Amino acid sequence: ELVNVVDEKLGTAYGEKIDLNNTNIAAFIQYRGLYPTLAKLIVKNAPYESVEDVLNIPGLTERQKQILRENLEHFTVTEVETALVEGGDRYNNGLYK
Amino acid sequence: IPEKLAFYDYIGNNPAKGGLFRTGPMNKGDGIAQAWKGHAVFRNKEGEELF
Amino acid sequence: AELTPEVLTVPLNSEGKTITLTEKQYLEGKRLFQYACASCHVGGITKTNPSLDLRTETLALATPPRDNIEGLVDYMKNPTTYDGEQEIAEVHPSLRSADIFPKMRNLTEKDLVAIAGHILVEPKILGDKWGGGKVYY
Amino acid sequence: MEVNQLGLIATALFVLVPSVFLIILYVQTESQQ
Amino acid sequence: MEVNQLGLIATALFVLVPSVFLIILYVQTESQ
Amino acid sequence: METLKITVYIVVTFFVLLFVFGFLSGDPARNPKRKD
Amino acid sequence: ANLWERFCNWVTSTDNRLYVGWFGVIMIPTLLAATICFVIAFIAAPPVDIDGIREPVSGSLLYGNNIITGAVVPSSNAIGLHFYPIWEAASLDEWLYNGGPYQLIIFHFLLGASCYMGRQWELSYRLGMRPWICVAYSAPLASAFAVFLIYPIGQGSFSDGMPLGISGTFNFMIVFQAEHNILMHPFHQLGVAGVFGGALFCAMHGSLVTSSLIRETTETESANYGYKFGQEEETYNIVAAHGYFGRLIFQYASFNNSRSLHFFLAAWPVVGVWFTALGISTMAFNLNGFNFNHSVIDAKGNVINTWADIINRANLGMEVMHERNAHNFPLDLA
Amino acid sequence: QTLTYDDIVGTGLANKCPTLDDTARGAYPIDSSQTYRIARLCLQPTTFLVKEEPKNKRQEAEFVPTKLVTRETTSLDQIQGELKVNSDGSLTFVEEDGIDFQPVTVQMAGGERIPLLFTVKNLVASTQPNVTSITTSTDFKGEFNVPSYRTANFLDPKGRGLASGYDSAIALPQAKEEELARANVKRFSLTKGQISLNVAKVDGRTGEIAGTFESEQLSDDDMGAHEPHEVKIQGVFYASIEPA
Amino acid sequence: METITYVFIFACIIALFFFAIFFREPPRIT
Ligand code: CLA
Ligand code: CLA
Ligand code: CLA
Ligand code: CLA
Ligand SMILES: C=Cc1c(C)c2cc3nc(c4c5[nH]c(cc6nc(cc1[nH]2)C(C)=C6CC)c(C)c5C(=O)[C@@H]4C(=O)OC)[C@@H](CCC(=O)OC/C=C(\C)CCC[C@H](C)CCC[C@H](C)CCCC(C)C)[C@@H]3C
Ligand SMILES: CC(C)=CCC/C(C)=C/CC/C(C)=C/CC/C(C)=C/CC/C(C)=C/CC/C(C)=C\CC/C(C)=C/CC/C(C)=C/CC/C(C)=C/CC1=CC(=O)C(C)=C(C)C1=O
Ligand SMILES: CCCCCCCCCCCCCCCC(=O)OC[C@H](CO[C@@H]1O[C@H](CS(=O)(=O)O)[C@@H](O)[C@H](O)[C@H]1O)OC(=O)CCCCCCCCCCCCCCC
Ligand code: HEC
Ligand SMILES: CC1=C(/C=C/C(C)=C/C=C/C(C)=C/C=C/C=C(C)/C=C/C=C(C)/C=C/C2=C(C)CCCC2(C)C)C(C)(C)CCC1
Ligand code: OEY
Ligand SMILES: [Cl-]
Ligand SMILES: [Cl-]
Numbered sequence: 001e002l003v004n005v006v007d008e009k010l011g012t013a014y015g016e017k018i019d020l021n022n023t024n025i026a027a028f029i030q031y032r033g034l035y036p037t038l039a040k041l042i043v044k045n046a047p048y049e050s051v052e053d054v055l056n057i058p059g060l061t062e063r064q065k066q067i068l069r070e071n072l073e074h075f076t077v078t079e080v081e082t083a084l085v086e087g088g089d090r091y092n093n094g095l096y097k
Numbered sequence: 098i099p100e101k102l103a104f105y106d107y108i109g110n111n112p113a114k115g116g117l118f119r120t121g122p123m124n125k126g127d128g129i130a131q132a133w134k135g136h137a138v139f140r141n142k143e144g145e146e147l148f
Numbered sequence: 149a150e151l152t153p154e155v156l157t158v159p160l161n162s163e164g165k166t167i168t169l170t171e172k173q174y175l176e177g178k179r180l181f182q183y184a185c186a187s188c189h190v191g192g193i194t195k196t197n198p199s200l201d202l203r204t205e206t207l208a209l210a211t212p213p214r215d216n217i218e219g220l221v222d223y224m225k226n227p228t229t230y231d232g233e234q235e236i237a238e239v240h241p242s243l244r245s246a247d248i249f250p251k252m253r254n255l256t257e258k259d260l261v262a263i264a265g266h267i268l269v270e271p272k273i274l275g276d277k278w279g280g281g282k283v284y285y
Numbered sequence: 286m287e288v289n290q291l292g293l294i295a296t297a298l299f300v301l302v303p304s305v306f307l308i309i310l311y312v313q314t315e316s317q318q
Numbered sequence: 319m320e321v322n323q324l325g326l327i328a329t330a331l332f333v334l335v336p337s338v339f340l341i342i343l344y345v346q347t348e349s350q
Numbered sequence: 351m352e353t354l355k356i357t358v359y360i361v362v363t364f365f366v367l368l369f370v371f372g373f374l375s376g377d378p379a380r381n382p383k384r385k386d
Numbered sequence: 387a388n389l390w391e392r393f394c395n396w397v398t399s400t401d402n403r404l405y406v407g408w409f410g411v412i413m414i415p416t417l418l419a420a421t422i423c424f425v426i427a428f429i430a431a432p433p434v435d436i437d438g439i440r441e442p443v444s445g446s447l448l449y450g451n452n453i454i455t456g457a458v459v460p461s462s463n464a465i466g467l468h469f470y471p472i473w474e475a476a477s478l479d480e481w482l483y484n485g486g487p488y489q490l491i492i493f494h495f496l497l498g499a500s501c502y503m504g505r506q507w508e509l510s511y512r513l514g515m516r517p518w519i520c521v522a523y524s525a526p527l528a529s530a531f532a533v534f535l536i537y538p539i540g541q542g543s544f545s546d547g548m549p550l551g552i553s554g555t556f557n558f559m560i561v562f563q564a565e566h567n568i569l570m571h572p573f574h575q576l577g578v579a580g581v582f583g584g585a586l587f588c589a590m591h592g593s594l595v596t597s598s599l600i601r602e603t604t605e606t607e608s609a610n611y612g613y614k615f616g617q618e619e620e621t622y623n624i625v626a627a628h629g630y631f632g633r634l635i636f637q638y639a640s641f642n643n644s645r646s647l648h649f650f651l652a653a654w655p656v657v658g659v660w661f662t663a664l665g666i667s668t669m670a671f672n673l674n675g676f677n678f679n680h681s682v683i684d685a686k687g688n689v690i691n692t693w694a695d696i697i698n699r700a701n702l703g704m705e706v707m708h709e710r711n712a713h714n715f716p717l718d719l720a
Numbered sequence: 721q722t723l724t725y726d727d728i729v730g731t732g733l734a735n736k737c738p739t740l741d742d743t744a745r746g747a748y749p750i751d752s753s754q755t756y757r758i759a760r761l762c763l764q765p766t767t768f769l770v771k772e773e774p775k776n777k778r779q780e781a782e783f784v785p786t787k788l789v790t791r792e793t794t795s796l797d798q799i800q801g802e803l804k805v806n807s808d809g810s811l812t813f814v815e816e817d818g819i820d821f822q823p824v825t826v827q828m829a830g831g832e833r834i835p836l837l838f839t840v841k842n843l844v845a846s847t848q849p850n851v852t853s854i855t856t857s858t859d860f861k862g863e864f865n866v867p868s869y870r871t872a873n874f875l876d877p878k879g880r881g882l883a884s885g886y887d888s889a890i891a892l893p894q895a896k897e898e899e900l901a902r903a904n905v906k907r908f909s910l911t912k913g914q915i916s917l918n919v920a921k922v923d924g925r926t927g928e929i930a931g932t933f934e935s936e937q938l939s940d941d942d943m944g945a946h947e948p949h950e951v952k953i954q955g956v957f958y959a960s961i962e963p964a
Numbered sequence: 965m966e967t968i969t970y971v972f973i974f975a976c977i978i979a980l981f982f983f984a985i986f987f988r989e990p991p992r993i994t
Contacts, residue, residue, distance in 0.1 A: 035229075037231050086908075089872065447970060448967055
């Protein structure tokens with residue numbers, strides 16, 4: 001009945017991909033062109049329903065919408081997990097080097 | 098009926114029910130009283146009250 | 149094992165062109181990197197922003213790309229954010245900002261390349277250690 | 286057997302303390318003579 | 319705390335037994 | 351706490367002065383050999 | 387004569403079973419207040435938020451400790467170096483939570499112990515002795531000032547002072563090695579030489595005087611009864627001890643002057659322990675022990691590890707675990 | 721007055737909310753065709769009550785007063801948010817940002833310490849309807865989120881945690897894990913609070929209001945290792961309303 | 965019982981201190 005909700009996420013697509021609703025902002029460094037500008041937007045605007053709602057962010061340039069399309073294959077969305085998003089842990093999760 | 102009063106009306110608090118080598122606190126014997134259960138009324142099948 | 153010209157060969161530009169270095173250049177580039185850079189970038193990390201290291205693979209994936217001497221000299225002249233979007237000479241030492249980063253006033257263009265070569269050569273030597281942080285000390 | 290644990294220290298002291306007192310007084314008696 | 323309950327008797331005789339030895343030796347000294 | 355603060359200040363103050371005046375009372379003379 | 391004079395002559399009486407003295411007048415109340423507070427806190431004090439993070443450490447016997455894990459816990463990092471008498475707290479309950487007894491104990495104690503030192507001077511003056519016993523005691527007094535006062539000063543918090551407990555002391559030692567490589571500081575290597583040599587020379591002098599005791603007893607009695615208190619004569623043959631020791635090594639590696647020998651015994655540990663107290667006191671200002679991390683490298687420039695790189699891996703394990711909830715940012719700068 | 725840091729520092733006044741003059745009891749006109757904002761909301765608790773646990777017989781739990789042990793660290797301030805005018809006329813404050821939480825530890829008779837996250841995160845407080853002006857009989861009633869007192873990286877003394885840490889009692893290799901599971905397994909709670917604010921002082925000139933608050937929220941449950949207590953907080957608030 | 969044992973033993977040590985100082989074999993000079 002009692003389960004570590006964080007380990008469980010690692011069994012979902014949060015474990016393979018950048019979860020646009022949960023993952024810390026420094027994982028967006030993994031792909032060209034996303035950090036810091038679009039990472040801040042994606043997160044600012046963060047709660048999405050499907051990965052493609054990210055293209056509708058108000059303000060994207062046309063190069064921006066293109067980069068997002070180029071890297072839609074690298075995103076997923078799962079349920080917002082409180083333990084991952086509280087404490088402002090999406091901006092700083094206590095991991096440095 | 099307040100529980101404090103009903104607890105007095107129970108022989109486990111009678112001082113004359115102990116033993117010379119049954120050591121420690123009363124709680125070591127019947128346990129720690131938690132709750133009055135209620136006053137038990139006994140009836141036979143004819144519905145007389147029994148005591 | 150030894151410092152050979154095959155180690156001292158690094159991408160000149162992103163064109164795939166390349167250049168070879170000497171023992172003297174590489175060692176000048178380690179000295180100058182210590183003098184101007186390692187206060188923050190010791191061992192390939194970045195103390196004031198651990199999220200960006202100097203690993204060749206990180207540089208590769210920056211806009212513009214920086215896993216060559218040219219894009220590195222350029223960044224030392226006119227730094228940008230990882231995505232190319234902002235200029236950051238106001239807070240990152242550069243020739244563009246050598247009035248407020250005085251260590252940069254006396255650096256020649258030959259000195260800048262020595263520093264890039266060092267940065268591109270050091271992971272071929274140390275691999276994971278460079279940009280790894282304390283896990284790898 | 287589920288037995289009172291302090292039974293042991295109680296019995297051990299009940300013996301040792303008075304017994305030691307008696308021995309102390311016997312031995313300093315022999316040394317007088 | 320869930321401690322060893324033979325620890326009390328062990329500490330107790332650890333103190334008493336060698337302690338008793340020394341008192342015995344001191345008193346029979348004072349009385350000669 | 352006010353009452354404790356005052357009372358500690360005064361205690362300390364008293365002791366301090368016993369120490370000061372005690373040594374100002376010709377301490378060099380208090381020794382077994384010579385009274386200067 | 388006058389009452390102030392009866393008093394002075396009592397304070398300084400060399401007839402009291404225990405000497406009072408003017409240092410004595412400050413030493414006595416302050417050591418009593420430290421001793422009574424310490425004993426009561428060790429048994430009964432409730433938990434203490436040492437690191438200022440609302441994670442209290444239980445140090446006392448009644449809250450589940452034993453003799454070996456028990457401590458009076460240092461005061462909160464939230465307090466830093468602020469003075470925190472009982473009268474600065476809203477309540478004893480607040481004072482206990484935030485570490486107040488530690489401040490009371492160490493201040494009264496540093497003070498009373500400093501006056502202990504002076505009292506040793508004082509009595510030696512009244513007895514007509516030479517005065518420098520108190521100088522030998524300055525070496526352990528210095529050491530207490532370092533772990534209780536100097537090191538918290540350099541680091542900004544009494545919370546980083548040495549706890550008053552057996553396991554707390556070890557805690558303090560491990561965190562210090564990680565943050566200062568104290569083993570690799572020469573002043574500590576000097577302190578070890580101070581104490582190993584001290585113990586060595588203790589056993590030697592003990593074994594050498596005892597080796598040369600003059601037969602003044604039989605085999606049925608302690609050889610100690612061959613010395614009579616305040617006897618005019620010496621009870622061992624120093625000439626005989628010299629002839630033994632000079633041969634064990636060579637003639638001039640051996641002392642034949644008693645005064646020179648005993649001054650050697652005093653100076654060796656005292657000096658070395660001055661150095662190691664100076665060691666803790668200077669690493670209080672992060673002047674740390676030698677760093678040979680990645681100091682050897684091959685023609686290519688691979689790191690060739692030495693034993694100092696193996697020390698640093700241990701250091702690093704202490705680093706990343708200690709005070710595991712208390713760092714938000716990558717460097718632990720105090 | 722216009723004091724300065726140096727005037728205030730080390731006195732405890734930094735943990736105090738501003739106050740309005742006893743004579744400040746006017747009213748702030750509200751204007752439907754306008755948009756409003758709280759530029760500063762300050763909450764300063766004065767008392768912390770915790771519901772005692774009534775025994776298995778129970779009868780009724782009272783709220784028992786407690787002792788503050790964490791010092792003058794308790795106040796919420798620099799809180800901002802917009803003030804909508806609703807359609808039934810009521811006004812609604814929607815907290816956006818601010819220093820909206822303080823960890824506090826109070827102590828109960830007998831020495832139980834009760835930590836809690838004193839908070840109004842995500843506060844949403846509305847007035848009764850048809851409010852044309854904020855007066856000295858205006859009430860808000862709100863609800864806020866109370867996240868876990870520790871966040872996911874916090875490690876317990878045996879190195880166990882949620883987002884980090886050991887996942888078992890490693891000091892007891894071959895113990896049965898069955899009975900330790902509630903302490904091996906860190907759970908992150910997020911519950912709900914409720915707060916009433918009661919305007920008692922108004923400066924219709926400046927846009928400054930002041931009054932008292934009461935809120936009810938849960939205490940720390942230590943990432944699921946024990947049940948939380950019910951807490952009631954009472955104190956005072958200041959607020960500054962600007963046009964937007 | 966463990967807290968008691970520790971405090972008892974510590975208390976006996978302090979009592980020992982008192983007799984060791986005040987009830988010593990007094991030293992004498994022959
Ligand atoms: C008049 C004295 C007195 C009284 C009435 C009590 C009463 C009590 N105490 Mg207290 N107690 C006392 C003195 C007293 N105590 C003293 C002096 C001490 C220190 C030693 C203690 C230490 C103490 C503790 C540590 C505890 C109590 C507890 C208790 C309770 C349970 C006691 C129990 O189990 O009895 C047991 C009694 C017996 C088994 C009878 C012993 C009599 C022996 C068998 C007679 C010896 C016969 C002799 C050898 C015959 C030979 C003679 C011939 C050769 C000439 C009870 C309220 C307990 C409690 O519940 O507290 C929470 C508890 O844990 N007491
Ligand atoms: C030799 C005696 C002596 C000394 C030197 C100290 C020393 C100390 N005590 Mg201790 N103390 C002692 C005896 C002593 N105590 C005794 C016997 C008790 C039991 C009553 C205590 C109980 C006690 C408590 C309960 C506390 C201390 C604390 C302290 C510290 C500072 C106290 C302070 O603010 O002083 C202030 C002293 C002065 C300003 C005097 C300066 C000297 C000048 C010459 C006189 C000044 C005039 C003065 C202002 C007039 C007084 C009245 C006025 C205010 C109306 C210090 C380590 C505090 C502490 O450890 O905090 C962590 C603390 O909380 N002590
Ligand atoms: C194999 C045995 C051995 C030897 C020879 C040494 C020797 C030494 N260690 Mg080590 N040590 C040992 C085992 C040993 N250690 C063990 C088992 C431990 C615990 C695990 C330690 C822990 C330890 C620590 C923690 C430290 C040392 C340190 C030292 C130095 C100071 C020791 C000192 O003053 O001793 C006391 C002895 C004397 C005062 C007498 C003189 C002894 C010297 C060394 C001999 C002189 C040689 C002589 C001049 C040559 C021949 C002369 C002839 C021609 C006339 C010294 C180099 C310290 C250090 O690193 O300093 C750099 C230090 O910090 N040791
Ligand atoms: C073989 C290994 C070895 C050896 C021999 C030493 C030896 C030493 N170490 Mg090092 N240490 C080691 C390993 C070792 N260490 C390791 C592995 C680590 C890393 C984990 C460290 C980390 C370390 C630190 C961080 C510190 C030391 C210190 C010391 C010194 C301790 C003794 C001292 O301070 O006396 C000095 C004497 C005293 C402190 C005594 C004070 C006496 C007071 C004034 C009187 C008290 C009265 C009392 C309360 C009442 C009694 C009365 C009663 C009779 C009724 C000594 C030189 C300490 C040091 O240099 O201290 C300055 C120190 O702080 N070490
Ligand atoms: C850990 C090592 C260590 C300890 C504990 C220690 C202890 C002592 N050394 C003394 C003396 C000396 N030590 C000397 C050399 C050395 N001492 C050394 C190492 C030590 N020396 C070393 C290595 C040397 C070689 C340099 C000399 C030369 C002297 C002396 O002259 C002196 C002495 O008198 O000789 C016997 C005594 C001072 C008495 C005093 O201050 O009464 C006053 C204090 C009293 C009565 C009570 C204190 C009560 C306090 C408030 C207790 C609470 C606070 C503590 C700090 C808590 C500690 C908890 C621990 C678990 C850390 C004391 C027995
Ligand atoms: C195969 C074959 C050839 C075998 C045959 C063997 C053969 C016969 C050999 C030929 C001869 C031979 C020796 C060949 C050469 C080999 C040779 C040179 C051996 C090398 C061995 C070696 C290097 C040993 C190292 C030396 C050593 C152990 C350390 C010495 C260093 C040193 C001087 C330290 C001590 C310092 C010091 C003086 C301490 C004082 C201590 C002191 C304070 C104690 C207290 C004290 C002192 C007193 O003083 C008195 C008074 C009293 C009271 C007293 O309390
Ligand atoms: C190139 C760099 C520049 C150069 C630098 C040079 C620095 C040299 C410094 C010299 C230091 C001064 C000499 C010592 C003082 C003095 O002589 O003592 C006085 C006595 C006199 O000796 C005794 O002398 C007596 C005669 S008299 O009194 O000296 O006149 C005689 O009676 C007796 O036999 C004899 O033993 O010395 C001794 O008794 C011998 C033991 C001396 C020990 C040395 C001093 C202290 C050692 C501390 C070591 C600390 C180590 C810590 C461990 C971690
Ligand atoms: C601290 C004051 C620094 C000093 C001195 C130097 N750098 Fe730096 N560097 C620093 C930061 C904070 C950052 C990240 C800036 C950002 O927001 O993007 C950087 C980044 C770089 C990079 C880019 C690495 C990447 O993965 O894209 C490079 C190539 C770089 N810095 C080089 C560099 C050199 C050569 C320096 C010495 C001349 C130097 N930096 C100094 C912080 C600091
Ligand atoms: C007069 C005189 C003298 C004497 C004096 C004296 C004798 C003093 C004393 C003093 C004292 C004797 C002091 C003491 C002090 C004490 C203290 C200060 C304590 C405190 C404590 C506390 C604070 C506690 C607390 C707690 C804890 C810790 C825990 C639990 C709880 C409680 C709360 C309880 C002389 C001779 C010198 C000379 C001159 C004159
Ligand atoms: O070592 Mn590491 O550094 Ca001197 O502080 Mn920063 O952490 Mn913390 O509280 Mn005690 O300790
Ligand atoms: Cl730690
Ligand atoms: Cl930090």
